[PDB]
Symmetry: C3
């Protein structure tokens, strides 16, 4: 049987909130079978929990935001990408504030935290969502598509014609496993223009955001002193975001995603569209010695 997985131990970490600029306290905890990933606001009394599911998504402006009433948690997608990447089905993510710390702008830190906590296989079948037919959404020139595929494959293309981007890799495809996620995707940082940072920092927004947690460009060049982690870092980050946003489905996906200039809003719209078309997907498990077409890291 292909089994569900959680964390072996509790692990804690801290970092700055992108929005607040204040220190946020993060705790990852084990969770029972069929819990999924659940965020909890432990600064609140009573504590408020928000399951990481598509139906709980609120705003999708800059990051993916989860909401329950007036209570929110944003900046969820990078951590969720790491949970998806390492095959973590069940976990609690406790936070002292309304956002997951941005860390270095990638999913790398979260991969390392999960690894440090250790993996624990659980006595319950892992559920997968298999794409059975094509589903797509578009918003202007932006497109996001699911097609059937025996495995998990994520493709993405951006299109920037600014000098800084002309001739750089702007398309990539990853045939997904834990191992191809950790080394080829997880450390890809988010990115934006310095003029966009300037604009947010004026009007006192994104107070924790800097070159320390993003690739920062201007019209002509990359401004980070140490350059890029990967030549394809820009497009790899979009793949990272897509993996994280798609994990709001609540289970590992068996299929193929293709994005063109897609963002959190379109990713979420694609999920909603899939979920509502019951003919386009099925829940599957792999029992009695059968195996899944996706490879995950051994505990």
């Amino acid at each position: 049987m292909i089994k569900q997985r959680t964390l072996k131990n509790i692990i804690r970490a801290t970092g700055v909130g992108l929005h607040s600029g204040e220190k946020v306290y993060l705790t990852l905890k084990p969770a029972p079978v069929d819990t999924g990933i659940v965020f909890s606001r432990t600064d609140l009394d009573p504590v408020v929990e928000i399951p990481a599911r598509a139906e709980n998504v609120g705003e999708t402006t800059m990051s993916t935001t989860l909401v329950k009433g007036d209570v929110k948690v944003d900046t969820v997608e990078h951590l969720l990408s790491a949970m998806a990447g390492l095959g973590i089905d069940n976990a609690y993510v406790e936070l002292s504030a309304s956002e997951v710390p941005i860390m270095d702008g990638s999913a790398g830190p979260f991969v390392f935290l999960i690894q440090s906590a250790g993996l624990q296989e659980q006595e319950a079948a892992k559920k997968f969502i298999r794409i059975k037919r094509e589903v797509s959404v578009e918003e202007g020139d932006k497109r996001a598509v699911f097609v059937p595929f025996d495995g998990f494959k994520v493709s993405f293309e951006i299109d920037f014609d600014h000098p800084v981007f002309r001739g750089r890799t702007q398309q990539a495809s990853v045939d997904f496993s834990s191992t191809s996620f950790v080394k080829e995707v997880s450390r890809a940082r988010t990115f934006g223009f310095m003029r966009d940072i300037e604009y947010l920092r004026s009007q006192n927004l994104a107070l924790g955001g800097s070159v320390e947690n993003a690739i920062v460009v201007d019209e002509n060049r990359v401004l980070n002193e140490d350059g890029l982690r990967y030549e394809d870092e820009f497009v790899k980050h979009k793949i990272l975001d897509a993996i994280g946003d798609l994990y709001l489905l609540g289970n590992s996906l068996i299929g193929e995603f293709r994005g063109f200039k897609s963002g959190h809003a379109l990713n979420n719209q694609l999920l909603r569209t899939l979920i509502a078309d019951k003919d386009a997907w099925e829940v599957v498990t792999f029992e009695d010695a059968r195996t899944a077409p996706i490879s995950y890291m051994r505990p």
Copy 2:
């Protein structure tokens, strides 16, 4: 006088439908005086005819689509460009499906079929639509203009800033006083991005679309093994498109067209706007061919 023209004989051909990926059966037939170009769906019972006229254009998303009720024929513009280019006034176009076959992505195959069918002059004056005053339309950054001109002239400019287009010819003008439609325009293939083909195919659209019927590019380079036919092939295909779309006026044009990033939608809008402005045009004939534009 300058006489109306039809085909001398029937001619048949086949080609894959861009949309369906299925073989489509095409027949070009002679037609009486004042018929214009009429498309006929022979797969339907009863047969449904749609005159190739500006008023009959439904959608314009990827190609020019003629519509009558729930029946449509799209990808009409490349064939219409050849009819316009060779001066065919009257003809029936019978089709087994909701699209004209895409052939090689240009008007070249239709030039052969029309010329092989032969030209037949008819005992009636050929009517022309002469532009008397400027008319224009815009949509976002896109523009389309008619300007008075003693002849027929089509100018077009595109504006792509992707590396694959930076530096390539993206503007051209053809004055048909001196210049041949067949030699200078007809063989220019349509074009687009491989990422768009991928997407369309995933939607079961463009099931017949490939490098065999388009110039296919990515962000940085032309993907076709043997590259372009002409250096200016991109912008010349836009001129081909304009000539075909403008022939939905129903008559040869005496005037100048100028497009900037104009597509089938804006082209049709220009026609509808022109038609509504009754003082911006007139119909003319030439009892002495010597008085016509060269």
Copy 3:
């Protein structure tokens, strides 16, 4: 005390109207204290006056247009930039038509005409509007912002990815405590594509527009035989426009403006937003 300033003498000029292609007559005249800059349609009877104030701006399609009822004056910003740059508080600008003549497409001619008129210091304190809190507006990808600053600074960035604009300065800052408006900004000409000119002409518009009053480009190159007045002429002209548009506040600014692809419409929207946000600004005079 820092005093208000008007013109010393009346000065006249003529030029082609950008829209009409007709000869337009202009007169600059002194004005009393607290008049501000006032445009006058002196071709009409009775004469119609439109104060150059943010509340009187109508259309912002290609230029800034002032309106009172059905009477308009457009293309005001280049002249206004000159008035602002030379510290002219009070003046009348009389016109024979609904547009300020375009001249050479820059503020240079207006600087020279104002300079020719001479300066007259007046017996009243000059009022400044000081920015005390950040104010911002946005429209699509365009942004305009005021930030507190001890002086006057204009920062601007454009973003064109056409070959003709690549490899040029597309961002500039001017701190007017160190930089001279007259030598570093005022001569920057307006600019646009020849295809845009051709389109306007076919609509019987911009009949007076040409290489004689603009930098004209195509997709790949500058078409003017003479090149550029400054390497950064394009962005400097946007700064020039910003200065003109901002002078519709009615007084000189103490603060910093930052624009990204901001045009006349967004510039005006920023002014109207600032005016309404009373806690973000104050009027100040200087006794010494």
